[PDB]
Amino acid sequence: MRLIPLTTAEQVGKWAARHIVNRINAFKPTADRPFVLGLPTGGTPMTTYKALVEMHKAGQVSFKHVVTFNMDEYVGLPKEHPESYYSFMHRNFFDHVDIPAENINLLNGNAPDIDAECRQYEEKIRSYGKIHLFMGGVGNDGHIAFNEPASSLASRTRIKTLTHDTRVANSRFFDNDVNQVPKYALTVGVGTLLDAEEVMILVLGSQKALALQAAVEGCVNHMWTISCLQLHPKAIMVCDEPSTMELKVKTLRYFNELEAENIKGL
Amino acid sequence: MRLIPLTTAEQVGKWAARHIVNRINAFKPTADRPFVLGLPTGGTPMTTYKALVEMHKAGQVSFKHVVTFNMDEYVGLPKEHPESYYSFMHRNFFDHVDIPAENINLLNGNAPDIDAECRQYEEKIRSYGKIHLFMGGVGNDGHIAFNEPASSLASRTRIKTLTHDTRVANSRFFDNDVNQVPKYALTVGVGTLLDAEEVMILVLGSQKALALQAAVEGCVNHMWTISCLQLHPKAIMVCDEPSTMELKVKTLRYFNELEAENIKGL
Amino acid sequence: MRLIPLTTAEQVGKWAARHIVNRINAFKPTADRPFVLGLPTGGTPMTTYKALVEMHKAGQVSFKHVVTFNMDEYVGLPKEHPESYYSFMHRNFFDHVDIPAENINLLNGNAPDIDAECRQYEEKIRSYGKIHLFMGGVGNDGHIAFNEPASSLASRTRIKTLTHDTRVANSRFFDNDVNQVPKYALTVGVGTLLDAEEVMILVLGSQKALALQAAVEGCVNHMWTISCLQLHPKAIMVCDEPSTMELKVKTLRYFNELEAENIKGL
Amino acid sequence: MRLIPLTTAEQVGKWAARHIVNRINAFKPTADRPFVLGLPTGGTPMTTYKALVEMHKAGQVSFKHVVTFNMDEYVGLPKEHPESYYSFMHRNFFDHVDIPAENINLLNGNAPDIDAECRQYEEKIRSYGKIHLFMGGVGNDGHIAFNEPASSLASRTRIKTLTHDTRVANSRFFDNDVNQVPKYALTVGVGTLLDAEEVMILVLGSQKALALQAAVEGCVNHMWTISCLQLHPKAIMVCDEPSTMELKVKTLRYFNELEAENIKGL
Amino acid sequence: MRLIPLTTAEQVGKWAARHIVNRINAFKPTADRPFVLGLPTGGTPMTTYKALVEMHKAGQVSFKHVVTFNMDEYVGLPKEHPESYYSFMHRNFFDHVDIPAENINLLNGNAPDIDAECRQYEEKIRSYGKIHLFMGGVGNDGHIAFNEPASSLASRTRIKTLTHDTRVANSRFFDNDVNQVPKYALTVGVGTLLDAEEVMILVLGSQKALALQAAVEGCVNHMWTISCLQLHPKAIMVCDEPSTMELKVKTLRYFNELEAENIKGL
Amino acid sequence: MRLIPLTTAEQVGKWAARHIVNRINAFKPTADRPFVLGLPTGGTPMTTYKALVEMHKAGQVSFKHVVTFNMDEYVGLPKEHPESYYSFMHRNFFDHVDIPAENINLLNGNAPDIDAECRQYEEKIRSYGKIHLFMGGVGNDGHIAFNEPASSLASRTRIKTLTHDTRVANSRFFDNDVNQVPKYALTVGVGTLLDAEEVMILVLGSQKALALQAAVEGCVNHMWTISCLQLHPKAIMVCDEPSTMELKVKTLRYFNELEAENIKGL
Numbered sequence A, B, C, D, E, F: 001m002r003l004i005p006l007t008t009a010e011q012v013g014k015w016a017a018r019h020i021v022n023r024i025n026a027f028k029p030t031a032d033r034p035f036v037l038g039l040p041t042g043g044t045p046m047t048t049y050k051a052l053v054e055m056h057k058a059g060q061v062s063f064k065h066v067v068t069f070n071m072d073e074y075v076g077l078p079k080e081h082p083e084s085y086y087s088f089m090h091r092n093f094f095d096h097v098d099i100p101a102e103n104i105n106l107l108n109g110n111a112p113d114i115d116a117e118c119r120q121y122e123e124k125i126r127s128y129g130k131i132h133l134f135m136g137g138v139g140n141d142g143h144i145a146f147n148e149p150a151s152s153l154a155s156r157t158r159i160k161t162l163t164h165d166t167r168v169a170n171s172r173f174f175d176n177d178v179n180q181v182p183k184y185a186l187t188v189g190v191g192t193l194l195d196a197e198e199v200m201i202l203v204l205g206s207q208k209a210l211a212l213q214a215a216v217e218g219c220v221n222h223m224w225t226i227s228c229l230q231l232h233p234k235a236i237m238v239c240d241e242p243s244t245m246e247l248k249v250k251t252l253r254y255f256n257e258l259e260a261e262n263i264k265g266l
């Protein structure tokens, strides 16, 4: 696992965007061989989306040949609701880039047949082969996507019932009313993520400090699903300062020496 | 992982039996495509066996097309001994149902070639493809089948030496004489169980409270082999009240909200 | 997992050598079907190398048909340096046995293309199929090979930056000057080791007590990479007395009863 | 320790306030023998001060012979500042009760000699002899009063430097500008608190769930000073529902039945 | 702390009983200066009372000038009930020794004013001044006397409500009917115990293995009140073999060599 | 607790030595009111004694009215032996300062009645009244003085039997022959230490990293007696860089800013 210890969310987003652009550009995607990118929503990826749009506008990247897959979506939330994940992704990313509409994949939380929706979603990823880079965040309770505590570390895309705390946390976007936050969501499983070629998790803020420690210094367990990355051959966690506060001095020292050159864009 | 928090062993057995019957019936087994069921012995599955026999007698299930595989068997215990696992399974289940004798699989603890016995057992499961549902219990020390502490989480069917505590625990059936409990047993491995399509563990009594916590809230480790279910994509633990006492309030609250409808047979 | 609780490093080496000889002899290697052995360096395997040379001289084993692969090698250390792993292996083993030079595999820490070196190394193991028995030691911090804390449990052969503590520990061989210990090394990954048919770890001295406990009684985690053996279907740890001091009385009692006969060569 | 498991903050306040009134009335304070009360600030005791004001107005209690001591005060913040603990206390409590100015004892955070201030404060308590009941809350990191992690469990009243985390927590009352909150504060020590005849801690909210677990289920340590209550002969923890989420089912079960009759008052 | 590692309960009793006799005889009790002895009930001290009776009959000790105090007593159970601690003590000890009735002090669980009872009890001890040796056992959850988990480490003699687990444990003496065991009990507190000049705890059985580990290797906390012995200047733990199974090899090693000569008495 | 985070042992010594001088000079010792100083041996305080000698020679401090007490002494080792703590103290400190022989108090490990020795020692301290400052180090397993793991947190001066590990640690001064180091030692107890008005512990080296974490972040327990400082009202830990490697980033951050001005002295 690589851990990039940065100072601010701004730097985090600049590092992540830069890494994505480099993967894409080094890959040289075509219409017959596209780059498959997995994406998250939430407050965490905002700086990364901001920097990506910039770079695109500056002619640094083209998503003309990039296929995207999102991690999850709320169940029973109208697609046009400002807070639906479909809305988020268009408002903050899709509307500003040159990605073909047929290249965008999102789960339908209003699918009449939930199981069919999830299976087809997995079948859609398979037809492309694999996700080259899956970007994500981490929940306060250590959840990756909506794979809440007690989720199988070998789980696939399926419906999950949101923890009360996740709902309270997400009430931010629902004018602080937990009663308005959807109780369920369609989400890719831990095994789905483990199948990605590279996984990049963004960690920002003190609220994630415990989740980072569980991920870095904790053991593999299903209560903190982010611990699954210990089993992934190519995981990177990009962090800011407050999120590293629960780590041991030696752990951070090691990562600091490691990424010294790699983080000095300046 | 799903955890069904019930109150009594009676309810546990009624839930388990019901789940098995539904799997079988929904599967619609034929002679060319049989349902493969993995089974345990011990005090734990008694209520489940009781309810299964009932349902069969009431014409709710037919084991005419069900192939069974048992988890383990004592080494060096005569097959006719009342306490041999072969005896247990016939006395409490086989004698009362319409399952063909050629459809029953049990390990021979008196096999002259222990390795040959175990290999053939694994070869027999393979010829059928896979075990559709493996039912089991959990030991006080967290063992699944006889995969005692320090057993490989990728182990296959093999011979294992019983822990002293397991023997003392099992002395119940040997008129409380530990000296009469077999020191060894042939058992399916953790990897053998992980290969099952669905795994259903029954947890009953306060003696299992620590094992349940290790399974639900603990990390993956080989000292408590029941933790292997965290790696299984389809595990269910059916519990009574005393076995949930070591769990965190939040953990039980989550599972209670989850199974509210699913447990209200009434 | 099997754990052989011996008393001295001498006995440890005699047990390990004996086990290797038995594997080789029982295997009956030919030029068309050679025995593939993975090997370590460091202070730990000295007694085992000593006993192996003896047995060979006594006509008990022939490495004429054995292919070897070493775990790691220092980056940027001249091959002729007495402390290079290449030097170690020739000085303490190769020079004294009848193994063909074309049967020896070592990583080139001076490879101009580090990635190419590591990939080819993995390709070389694959061409042979698999490593039949991989012998190794364990670091104070729980590292297996140079898979330092925070290494992926699914990692392959690659370059790794040595922890400061590992360097201080290895300064023994560099006349106690940490500044002389190479900062990097080419090493086989955890997944590379997990792929071996059998893994035998030698644990000697009180300095390894914490690493042994992490391995035996701890949970699977990437901070203590030796915990990966819990996932291996055929691991054995051969220990002396001081290295078992952190284990629970019950754990050692179990292993003592288990290996009573198997360790009484006398 | 007694732990009163309630559902709501309103209930906590009603319970706590009734407890104080009962103790005072049983004591029968007079001019020569006043009842000494220790009090806190923060959002936690708001419902309690409210209820207390209700009871006084209703003629249920009089503070005419109650001497009070507050836990702490910010250093350098002007007395008349709306957020000084002096203002909080008057705005929320003193302004509505019949307590004579003589009886109010608050730490002077703007004293010329901070060392002398703290010492005279401890002297004040001693002069009266003993604080009969000390009410307080608990910080998110378990700090009691301003005895931050790593404070001595035998500490007395002194100047203390706040944890960045505490400042972030308190920034709420300073328009969320961490730069606004005072870096230092005068506070009673853990020893001062342990000297109190009875200690009642109010726990409200999910943010305090870890602190509550540390206090009830953890060991005594100076990182979570709230754990010092395990050494107190008369300690009570009054909690609302979300604060008990990290406790064990058995832990909450025990307390629920103990306090059953004691909370049915409604 | 001293820990006497023995093999059998008979040895524990013989050791413990010799210790008491030695202390008494060294003390040279008289009418004005009696030796004060604290005593427990339960299955644990059976071998000790037996040995003690043997020694007295043999003319080795006399209790004519020994004042005794028992740890606890069930509330509401009639004195003459075969299971009241009053009956246990007489049936098993007093009936066979020369202790005058005056010297026997037991808690009256059927007193009209439970509060007054506990207080007078503490007064009794103070009148004599000090308990020279307090013998006791440890519950499965580490409770000492009836100071159940969450009791204050500074508690005094008071009424206590038993844990459901304790009641299940004690149901043995009530024909295994949990409904038969008293929900309450008067008991000496942890403080009362810590006031004893010397405390000797007998640990027998596998059921006490976790409690013994908590006491010796755990931290001080009120969940396992037996941990309070870490703060005692003169504490001894006398154990049989299965009770030491959760300790570390090094822990038991240390104690074994310390007590080597001390237990060879046979 | 205060923790002074320094980089080098030289800095630790300079800091610690300045602290002692400051305290002495502020105290203004005289013949009737001497300053009582507790002192340790071992490699840890070498830089401190050196600095102290420098300051005395420079006319900054005088020990003419300082009474000193040492923590411990080997039993059975002749006084004049180069490694007796008596020799260490004179060779390294007393020989260079103006302290009169009358003022030196060392434990006599070759006394005819070890019990009487320890008791008179405690009497010596009491006669002076109080040790104003006790300087000491911490063992690798966190033992303070020779109060090895499992010593009472309320212990007094007594004979103690060393842990094999401690002997291995001290064999350095006995030509690395463990057989050379004394199995027993007279030592001040944890209680004796807690009675000191102020306790300053010097922590140097990576070998002490776990002990430092136990002391600062662990719970109070008798396995790591250094944890007793959490109950002390005036404790200071002076550390070099590698000793802080197991602490949390936040823990070291806190202390760094507290002591910022306090260590800039250089």
Ligand SMILES: CC(=O)N[C@@H]1[C@@H](O)[C@H](O)[C@@H](COP(=O)(O)O)O[C@@H]1O
Binding pocket: A150, A151, A152, A155, A158, A159, A160, A161, B001, B002, B233, B234
């Ligand atoms: C409607 C609903 O919420 N269904 C989910 C199911 O999809 C999931 O598989 C299981 C937990 O299992 P997992 O997290 O291990 O997949 O919980 C619930 O049954």
Ligand SMILES: CC(=O)N[C@@H]1[C@@H](O)[C@H](O)[C@@H](COP(=O)(O)O)O[C@@H]1O
Binding pocket: B150, B151, B152, B155, B158, B159, B160, B161, C001, C002, C233, C234
């Ligand atoms: C006769 C006997 O008891 N043999 C078992 C062996 O079958 C098992 O493989 C090993 C533990 O390994 P495992 O639990 O990881 O398979 O212990 C013993 O050697």
Ligand SMILES: CC(=O)N[C@@H]1[C@@H](O)[C@H](O)[C@@H](COP(=O)(O)O)O[C@@H]1O
Binding pocket: A001, A002, A233, A234, C150, C151, C152, C155, C158, C159, C160, C161
């Ligand atoms: C030059 C160097 O040191 N490169 C390594 C890289 O090879 C390794 O993959 C990664 C940790 O990841 P891993 O331990 O999980 O493979 O750390 C560093 O980036």
Ligand SMILES: CC(=O)N[C@@H]1[C@@H](O)[C@H](O)[C@@H](COP(=O)(O)O)O[C@@H]1O
Binding pocket: D150, D151, D152, D155, D158, D159, D160, D161, F001, F002, F233, F258
């Ligand atoms: C100005 C200031 O912040 N002073 C405090 C001091 O009062 C306190 O004693 C010590 C920690 O110790 P304690 O928390 O154990 O008293 O830290 C700081 O030096």
Ligand SMILES: CC(=O)N[C@@H]1[C@@H](O)[C@H](O)[C@@H](COP(=O)(O)O)O[C@@H]1O
Binding pocket: D001, D002, D233, D258, E150, E151, E152, E155, E158, E159, E160, E161
């Ligand atoms: C009737 C009854 O059960 N009373 C006890 C009380 O005596 C005890 O003080 C408290 C717990 O506190 P302690 O264990 O810390 O004294 O719980 C209960 O209220």
Ligand SMILES: CC(=O)N[C@@H]1[C@@H](O)[C@H](O)[C@@H](COP(=O)(O)O)O[C@@H]1O
Binding pocket: E001, E002, E233, E258, F150, F151, F152, F155, F158, F159, F160, F161
């Ligand atoms: C000769 C010898 O080694 N005596 C000590 C004794 O002095 C000490 O009190 C006890 C442990 O108790 P403590 O460490 O709690 O005092 O162990 C040993 O018996």
